[PDB]
């Protein structure tokens, strides 16, 4: 009954306070005193006529402050060092087991609240330090964050005020789980969790989150664990097959310490997400000043070629794993407008899509996330703010932009530059002009759909002296031109990005690809002029080659084969080209599809 | 009485172009309401026989593999 | 080459033709193409004043195998109306004198489709089809209006039955019943544009940060 | 002069009930135009899809 545990609670405790008042063994002794105390404190009930108020127990052990009073005089005893870290590890467990066990929200009281500020004072000295008092400490402090997340109104009661005037606060519930961000296991995963839940808690309340965002070093302990950890990451990706690309979800688990890397990314994702305007703000500038341009900025500059592909590779994996657009901003503002030596980030990958290896795969993959991102300012830097003044257009033709191939004009001259010994003499690839027809329909409304919070339409209205179409344009158009040469997956990502691009629905760009019809200055070279020259090389390797009908059957039989499995100079410029061959017919008929869509897609989606 | 005419004159004319604007409101909420209930009745008629029709299109719906270079990209990622 | 994607040219190019005959505004004039055949368009005009008042004309747009390269489309009624220029045992509307030649990119099907319904809103005597209807307009015009209400009267009691072409989408009424028209009617009245849509799940969503009016990347105010 | 005051209360009368006819003719015009778009709209786009359906199932058919 609840009554004669107050008669033994003060039995231990009036033993308690004759010991302050008059050394091992009256620490014992208060030692087991506070355990039988405290467990008898986690166990107390209220009263069942007012069950809102407090118990008994916090009636008798609040009005004088007892758990302040028994801590900091065992504080006091604490500078013998005696067992600094046993007696340290037990009131630890004591007062999580007052947070975890009682059932009553104790923190609602101040002296309760008090004791627990000043243990956590007491367990901020500094290193080095047992793991157990570390699992101890990131143990309570978790508890009281859940404890606090189940009770919002107490963030600014820990906010405790500042003991010198223009001093920084002391939040003792953030600052100390600060150190402990950047550790793996579970103890690092409950540290993230807690500071995740303060950060909740935080975006609620405007001095906490300028407490945060202005007297704490949370953000550079963000930024420089970002720039530590790339670092860490090899500078060499061994991955034996040629048909990579980019890092898959085996490649980066693979290596330990790119898995780090992309941990503390997805924390600094969840916090971005997650936290307060002013604290957002503050993390985005200290992740652009502190990660992207003193490290990341040199670091893909670096000339040696398996440093550009990991550094290639490393960045397009960043880019597809944020999914706020509060950090998208920030990285693509670095790789847009961040300028080293006189030239544009963005414009050095640019030139880097034209190059002969897997340099050139990583690049194309790296451009492929970017469009696949489907912002404006990417596409607008590469493409349309060298088509917007619409200079590549002569002066009688600029109304033939906002046409639209209603009757397949464009789509019948694609398909006539179809090679005479591509074409069916009198196996799947002769008749799967209706498969390509369907990813033309789904490739335009995806556009369509990440098209509509855009700024303008650029149909040629809203809004060198010769023109200039770019150079995204000519680096693709020249490395489109030598499609013999290339490899078979270099082909594939190249021809993925122009059949990507073409579903754009910007009317600037899909008369300047997409409508034959249209003539442009002789400076200009067109995606047709491009194709034709390609036709008339793929035909004169027709020609010089003897085993030709024999190396087609074969080398389509592989091709599907592959998605159902799902002297050396000689040899591979025979290789390239045959593969040439069977891509080229194809990729005929998928920049047809997509001008067919074009004419198709409803006005209820613009 | 020669003022009286006239103005029961105008005041019937009035009550004329009253009754031609009655008439023709009547006529045009008629038609209107006529033909929203000619069209909500075709629609529904045409969803009823669409989801007859889907009994096969359940079937007809089954499909998958894309285009052949959709297809193989994809499948470039496969070592 | 060329004959073996011709029905894809010419079947894209009448689905392109009703996605522009959705983008023009035709008041009353609902459109629908056939299920087997894609030559055919079925639809209904409803004449919203003149002389013609609350009359509902169902029709059957023929278009030609050769679409643009061809002739004027073929336009048919499903009752003859007793007009000037419609055939009175057949119901073919005289669409070929406004559009004697089909020229390319610039004739489509809603101007056809347009001139339907003007047809039945300036009545044109000049060598007709119908000729007892022409004599009728520009002499005795009562018994035009009687015999044009009548004919309506003709037209609005075959419009329940089994249409005259049977196809999976043809356009085929029934009697009003409000217990389950009301749930229909609510659930055009609940539909909305694609913004806010009820595809809230897949996240496709699109990235800006250029000031409106202007050609410089994140020059959108904070 | 009471044969003009009730006339003329007459015609007051004629002129208000035009004012509410008017009105009322404007406000179910309104109603009709505003909705005559979301009927039609919501006619034309099930009319495009199925039209988009038999357009592929037909384009199948012939290979």
């Known amino acids: 009954d609840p009554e004669t545990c107050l008669m033994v609670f003060k039995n231990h405790w009036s033993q308690v306070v004759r010991i302050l008042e008059r050394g091992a063994d009256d620490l014992s002794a208060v030692r087991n005193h506070t355990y039988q105390m405290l467990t008898l404190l986690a166990e107390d009930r209220a009263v069942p006529s007012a069950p809102t108020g407090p118990g008994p127990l916090l009636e008798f052990a609040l009005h004088e402050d007892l758990l302040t009073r028994v801590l900091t005089w065992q504080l006091q005893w604490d500078e013998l060092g005696d067992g600094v870290e046993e007696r340290r590890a037990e009131q630890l467990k004591l007062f999580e087991m007052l947070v975890s066990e009682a059932r009553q929200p104790l923190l609602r009281h101040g002296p309760v609240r008090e004791a627990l500020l000043t243990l956590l004072d007491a367990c901020g000295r500094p290193v080095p330090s047992s793991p157990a008092l570390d699992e101890g400490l990131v143990l309570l402090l978790s508890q009281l964050c859940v404890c606090v997340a189940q009770e919002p109104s107490l963030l600014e009661f820990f906010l405790q005020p500042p003991p010198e005037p223009g001093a920084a606060p002391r939040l003792l519930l953030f600052s100390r789980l600060v150190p402990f961000v950047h550790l793996e296991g579970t103890l690092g995963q409950q540290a993230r969790d807690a500071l995740l839940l303060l950060m909740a808690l935080s975006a609620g309340s405007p001095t906490v989150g300028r407490y945060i965002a202005d007297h704490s070093y949370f953000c550079p302990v963000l930024a420089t664990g970002l720039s530590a950890l790339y670092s860490s990451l090899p500078r060499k990706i061994e991955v034996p097959g040629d048909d990579w690309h980019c890092l898959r979800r085996e490649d980066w688990l693979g290596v330990p310490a790119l898995a780090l890397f992309m941990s503390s990314l997805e924390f600094c994702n969840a916090v971005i997400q997650v936290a307060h305007p002013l604290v957002q703000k503050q993390l985005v500038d200290y992740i652009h000043n502190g990660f992207l341009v003193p490290v990341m900025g040199p670091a893909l500059h670096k000339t040696s070629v398996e440093e550009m592909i990991a550094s290639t590779a490393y960045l397009e994996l960043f880019l597809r794993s944020i999914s706020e657009p509060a950090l998208l901003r920030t990285f693509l503002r670095f790789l847009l407008l961040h300028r080293h030596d006189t030239h544009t980030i963005l414009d050095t990958l640019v030139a880097r899509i034209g190059s002969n290896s897997r340099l050139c795969m990583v690049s194309l993959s790296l451009f492929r996330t970017l469009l696949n991102l489907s912002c404006e300012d990417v596409l607008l830097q590469l493409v349309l703010r060298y088509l917007v003044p619409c200079n590549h257009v002569m002066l009688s033709q600029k109304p033939a932009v906002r046409d639209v191939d209603l009757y397949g004009r464009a789509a019948d001259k694609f398909l006539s530059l179809i090679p005479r010994c591509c074409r069916h003499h009198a196996g799947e690839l002769e008749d799967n002009y209706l498969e390509y027809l369907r990813e033309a329909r789904r490739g335009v409304d995806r556009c369509v759909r990440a098209c509509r919070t855009w700024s303008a339409p650029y149909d040629g209205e809203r809004p060198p002296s010769q023109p200039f179409t770019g150079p995204f344009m000519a680096v693709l158009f020249a490395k489109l031109e030598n499609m013999l040469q290339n490899s078979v997956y270099v082909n594939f990502l190249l021809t993925g990005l122009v059949a990507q691009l073409a579903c754009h629905p910007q009317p600037l760009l899909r008369s300047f690809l997409l409508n034959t019809n249209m003539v442009f200055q002789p400076s200009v070279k067109s995606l047709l002029q491009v194709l034709g020259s390609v036709k008339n090389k793929i035909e004169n390797f027709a020609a010089s080659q003897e085993d030709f009908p024999a190396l087609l059957s074969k080398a389509k039989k592989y091709l599907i084969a592959r998605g159902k499995l799902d002297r050396q100079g000689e040899a591979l410029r025979v290789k390239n080209a045959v593969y040439c061959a069977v891509i080229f017919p194809e990729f005929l008929k998928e920049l047809a599809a997509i001008s067919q869509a074009h004419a198709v897609t409803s006005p209820f989606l613009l | ?79 | 080459t060329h004959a073996s994607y011709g029905p894809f040219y010419l079947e894209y190019s009448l689905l392109a033709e009703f996605t522009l005959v959705v983008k023009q505004k035709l008041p009353g004039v609902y459109v629908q193409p056939s299920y087997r055949s894609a030559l055919m368009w079925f639809g209904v005009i409803f004449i919203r004043h003149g002389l013609y008042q609350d009359g509902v004309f169902k029709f059957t747009v023929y278009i030609p195998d050769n679409y643009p390269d061809g002739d004027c489309p073929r336009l048919v009624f499903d009752i003859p109306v007793f007009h000037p220029l419609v055939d009175p045992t057949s119901g073919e509307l005289d669409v070929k004198r406004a559009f004697a030649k089909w020229r390319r990119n610039h004739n489509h099907i809603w101007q056809v489709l347009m001139y339907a319904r003007r047809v039945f809103y300036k009545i044109d005597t000049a060598s007709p089809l119908n000729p007892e209807a022409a004599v009728l307009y520009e002499k005795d015009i009562q018994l035009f209006k009687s015999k044009v209400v009548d004919s309506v009267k003709v037209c609005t009691a075959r419009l329940f039955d089994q249409p005259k072409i049977e196809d999976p989408y043809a356009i085929s009424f029934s009697p009003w019943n409000p217990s389950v028209h009301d749930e229909a009617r609510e659930k055009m009245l609940t539909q909305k544009k694609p913004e806010e849509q009820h595809n809230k799940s897949v996240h496709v969503a699109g990235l800006s940060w250029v000031k409106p009016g202007s050609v410089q990347p994140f020059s959108k105010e904070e």
């Open chain 2, 1 to 79: 009485a020669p003022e009286i005419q006239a103005l029961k004159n105008q005041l019937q004319e009035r009550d004329r172009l009253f009754h031609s604007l009655e008439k023709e409101y009547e006529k045009t909420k008629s038609q209107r309401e006529m033909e929203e209930k000619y069209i909500v009745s075709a629609w529904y008629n045409m969803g009823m026989t669409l989801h007859k029709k889907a009994a096969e299109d359940r079937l007809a719906s089954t499909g998958s593999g894309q285009s052949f270079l959709a297809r193989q990209r994809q499948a470039t990622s496969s070592r």
